[PDB]
């Protein structure tokens, strides 16, 4: 029903990982992009809105979802995208070649013939420099999920009508919750959390025909074994940290470097980390991929490090070399990093004000230097060079081929075309930002987003929202209690406005 | 390829569980007993030695091991036992009906046809009241075993050495990672490294397991008109230990099989030893505290403090007794009656004791006044401890206290100690128990004849030409007085060990 964008599937992200390993991926705004299992186009349509000079095709077996996708394209007036109701076996050489082929969460749930087809179009229908994305469930990690599925199916095999079998199975998962309320074994914990995740899902994935669906249960070496038959080569995983070695003893590392097989090492990692799923990038066997990543390769990319300092910049002296300042990652408490280095502090405060807006190497270093009285530039370049790629290969810093964006003008805030469309015309409570990520919005934010065309300032936006609370159509609660006072509503709207503009600026919702 | 006895498969154990659930099983000493997957017969021959009026039939695919079994039947002069080199698909109606059938560690490794056959003879070839034992690996718990086997096969692509440094390398890469999965894989890989070479075959690693869920196994069983009796480890059926609200739910639904299957899901059950019986038998699953009167009792407990040094009537003094018998698991009590019971168990170790023997012998410690209080203590606690696995029940009779002037071992273990390279022996409980060279050489000479100095006299004959090397500590023997005193220091604990381990008649 709900068709989400997946930021990990963004073609610019695949292009970035291709550049990291030495492949020049086709330009994104010129490209031709295919999606297998498009499912109403929420993962495709936003790109089509962003890239008028690029072409998009998507394919799904559900007539309902394809009609929904066509309805969204028509409502949006997109001329560059088309959707097909067919199976993957219908794909032809008449479809042509694509620079990026996205296949997300499908290949595990389809028969061997359709998996053969998927591997065959990711080769036949892929450009020389193109990238193919395929995500799939993996062993050993999928064993627990399969166990729970067999467990719900066995418990519900008494009842024949699909309506009650779902719960049923909710009663099952809650009995797994109850009976383990006191248990010390690690297995009780694993099963408890897994049954919690399953308990939180809604009714679509809990149908007994979806539980009776058979998973391919790939090991990574078997997946790559089938990919190599079609002459597809392993590029990388879209979460780079999964490939990271060096949280491990330096001897074990030296042996993993001894063997040169990327797939064999990856498979060992899967065995000992209990890998349940993978997002794998494939490219033609003919490309020479370079796995030697220097600290200096960080200059090839624009850099995003999302950190919220605990102490505002105006309250600290960065030139203090004995003071430990901490910064929170995507959050937080549970993830934070501290430094006494004036240079690392300057760089981190530079990243903190640029949140989710790509910054080049020269921009980070220079902007950081202006905080240090512009005398430290070489020190700052050195600090970034020493820590940057290590923080990238661990997943803490994001590299991208995406360009730096001009700072949004905030007197009349302007959001993008896709989120104006979703906030005006869509029931969903999330919107799709410039990074191809879903970000949730409340009713006040969703109503506010309708009115940011670039011509409306703070007072006109708030006047429109006031229009909506008049019909109601909105309601405002400053406490568990709600405020209907005329003059109080206008105050609560003003108090809500500023942090909302901050939130939009940091989440890449503003142009 | 060393054939072991498995005490869990003892026909007297199956008989005991059947009695617990209300089936009267055939008399063991007069019964007929079939073993599928027998050879080399270390799981069968001991019973043939113990019961000359019972007949035994082994069946195994290995010619070499059937030959070995027949060599040992020849040496032991047994007329009651016979072995066949044949497939299980060869077993007939002409084989007749058996009172006990034992299938251990086979059915999970054989194809569908042979599994159907095993279920077929465990019905067709089973006597009316007979019992069938079938052991198998089970999901979910086997997922982790399969995984490691996969991890070992994929790395093998001299094969046992790389499996060893791969299991080692898993432990090193995990040198520590706090994640619970690193601990699970660490202990699993550790135990699989503790095994030696015969499950590592790389031919056995490539073998395919049936991967039974309990309900699938029981489905195949019910097609053959067999019903679930119990598990040979009884504590695995124990509930509660679980929230009382859950036990009301499981006790509400009536199916034993899906109750056990739910417990398998939540407890991650890797193995089952299952007792099947004919479908026409009525099973009584109501078990009461005084059912304990039906059985002879073995509670293996070593007291923290001896009896001479404690006053059983001191009720502010809480005395502790150790179970396995190490340290970790232990039972502590303030009760004079429970102290008398536990001390009575502590000097009877591995010798079954009837309710009357336990309560009376405990009563003489209390000055013969307290018999009723002791009966109440035992009656209240005992079955609770049996269903939790702490106390053993058996239909086996009490055995006479062995006479220690000239200690005498059983017919099987003098044969093993004299004629066999193995470093373990098979006691009267059908348990393999390990012995060093000193204990084995000593068991060679233990008959009704040799007294302590005759036994030491003969063992000195071996260390003379040895073949036997004593130490003290360590690797130290000087020709006379590093021996012959070190012997005497070894001898009394050895007789104690043989006494409590049921190696003495």
Curated annotation (Swiss-Prot), chain B:
InterPro entries: CFA/CMAS, Methyltranfer_dom, MeTrfase_reg_dom_prd, PKMT_C, SAM-dependent_MTases_sf
Top-level taxon of origin: Bacteria
Gene3D superfamilies xrefs: Vaccinia Virus protein VP39
Protein name, entry field: Uncharacterized protein RP789
Organism: Rickettsia prowazekii (strain Madrid E)
